[PDB]
């Protein structure tokens with residue numbers, strides 16, 4: 001007993017077992033199937049035309065026969081479209097990408113309790129505000145093929161996957177130390193590549209790896225990164241201190257996007273604070289509220305700029 005969805009680009013079909021998996025109290029694989037069919041119909045108008053539209057109204061998620069009929073109508077419509085295309089890879093839309101990331105998560109993180117994460121902006125709630133805030137961050141930073149993006153403490157790798165599907169960075173890296181999210185990240189990686197191929201969508205190169213971003217090997221890797229993403233909101237003072245030391249080796253114009261600033265927003269260089277990281281980096285608070293109707297959230301953009309320090313010294317020598 002199983003259900004199959006043919007790929008719109010002729011990749012291997014998506015296969016679901018019956019009874020269909022349940023994700024939470026109000027979400028399951030049956031809703032995922034219906035939403036997948038709807039998304040494919042949306043971005044392939046010929047499919048929407050060939051598809052018997054009533055089938056998306058009259059379905060019963062608790063009936064194997066009804067769900068099989070729904071999948072069959074979609075599969076026949078896919079077949080008709082493939083016949084039309086017989087007779088003579090872009091990036092996913094923001095809406096499709098939100099769907100893909102949720103789908104990759106539900107097929108990968110089968111036991112979300114094992115994460116032991118009770119925090120806001122955690123893998124289990126990525127769809128609520130994280131996805132929208134990360135999308136805003138992507139639009140604001142405007143990365144190119146010369147950039148290298150790194151998420152320090154990448155969890156199950158959701159930020160890396162979103163950024164890789166949206167930008168043309170040379171490479172995207174996610175580094176995670178904890179065993180359970182790093183293990184889940186391996187499945188997220190496989191599931192993302194599989195689903196992106198199923199939809200026929202392109203993504204930039206990325207790597208999800210297990211490691212300690214405070215290690216010796218990661219010192220030079222942070223120094224060579226042009227865009228660091230770090231959810232440091234709950235980090236201790238020792239980790240924060242160690243991170244500022246790593247950032248102090250970054251190149252001019254290197255950027256850090258974070259949930260808590262690494263230097264004060266109103267930093268004023270003087271003879272008593274020449275040690276502070278604020279001497280070599282600009283910091284700005286970015287808020288989507290400044291057509292955002294979600295949570296009143298903010299993030300912090302840091303830009304390596306050693307002319308802050310140079311200007312202080314030239315001002316002492318040129319009074």
Ligand SMILES: CS(=O)(=O)c1ccc(N[C@@H](c2cccc(Cl)c2)c2ccccn2)c(Nc2ncccn2)c1
Pocket residue numbers: 119120121122130131133134137159229230231232233234257258259260296297298299300
């Ligand atoms: C100052 S804020 O309160 O508005 C705020 C705002 C943002 C975050 N996180 C997000 C974030 C982090 C860095 C850069 C960006 Cl572009 C976005 C985020 C997105 C995806 C995955 C994890 N994180 C957090 N993070 C947090 N909040 C409570 C407990 C643990 N973390 C807090």
